């Protein structure tokens, strides 16, 4: 049991996946999404193109140092997700925009992404299952 779709998302974003970070944030998007959420858009205030969507928002990958993404839960529970690049790592930091609850998590790109396999979804992810737990158990659960 892990939900289907990461391969698709990664295909659907494929032109956009250029750096390790991009793949990291792509994996993150699908875990947010498969656990109740719908993406809303880029940035931290709603721009003019806020489609409720499962896809990555347009310009989700413009800034390789900082990723800013807004989500909104199937039923309720809105979200502001920041993936901050630091050296060989990312800091995930996530706000429930309406309980100012806050989650954190740091991830070593050296241990999870392969820059030498970016062009191949099947070898991009070095530790799908650990990466999946850490993210679930560290960012999603603290609803």
Describe the structure.
Keywords: Acetylation, Cytoplasm, Endoplasmic reticulum, Methylation, Phosphoprotein, Proteasome. It is found in: Cytoplasm; Endoplasmic reticulum. Plays an important role in control of proteasome function. Inhibits the hydrolysis of protein and peptide substrates by the 20S proteasome. Also inhibits the activation of the proteasome by the proteasome regulatory proteins PA700 and PA28. Belongs to the proteasome inhibitor PI31 family. This is Proteasome inhibitor PI31 subunit. The chain has about 140 residues and is α+β, with helices and mostly antiparallel strands. It has one domain: 3-Layer(aba) Sandwich (Protein Transport Mog1p, Chain A), CATH 3.40.1000.30. Helices cover about 30% and strands about 25% of the residues. It contains five helices and five strands. A five-stranded antiparallel β-sheet has the order 1-2-3-4-5. Helix 1 crosses helix 2 (about 20-35) and helix 2 (about 20-35) packs across helix 5. The chain is globular, with a radius of gyration of 14 Å. The relative contact order is 0.18.
Number of helices: 5
Do you know the CATH architecture? 3-Layer(aba) Sandwich
Q: Give the proportion of residues in helices.
A: 25-40%
CATH fold topology: Protein Transport Mog1p, Chain A
Strand content: 25-35%
CATH class: Alpha Beta
Which class of secondary structure composition applies to the elements?
alpha+beta
PDB class: hydrolase inhibitor
Keywords: polymorphism, hydrolase inhibitor
Assembly: monomeric
Entry title: Structure of a conserved dimerisation domain within Fbox7 and PI31
């Amino acid at each position: 049991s892990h939900m289907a779709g990461l391969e698709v998302l990664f295909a659907s974003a494929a032109p956009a996946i250029t750096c390790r970070q991009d793949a990291l944030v792509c994996f993150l998007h699908w875990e947010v999404v498969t656990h109740g959420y719908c993406g809303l858009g880029v940035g931290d205030q709603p721009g003019p193109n806020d489609k409720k969507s499962e896809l990555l928002p347009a310009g989700w990958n413009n800034n390789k140092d900082l990723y800013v993404l807004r989500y909104e839960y199937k039923d309720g529970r809105k979200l502001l997700v920041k993936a901050i690049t630091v050296e060989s790592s990312m800091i995930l930091n996530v706000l429930e925009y309406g309980s100012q609850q806050v989650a954190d998590l740091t991830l070593n790109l050296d241990d999870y992404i392969d820059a030498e396999h970016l062009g191949d979804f099947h070898r991009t992810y070095k530790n799908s299952e650990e990466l999946r737990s850490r993210i679930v158990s560290g960012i999603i659960t603290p609803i």
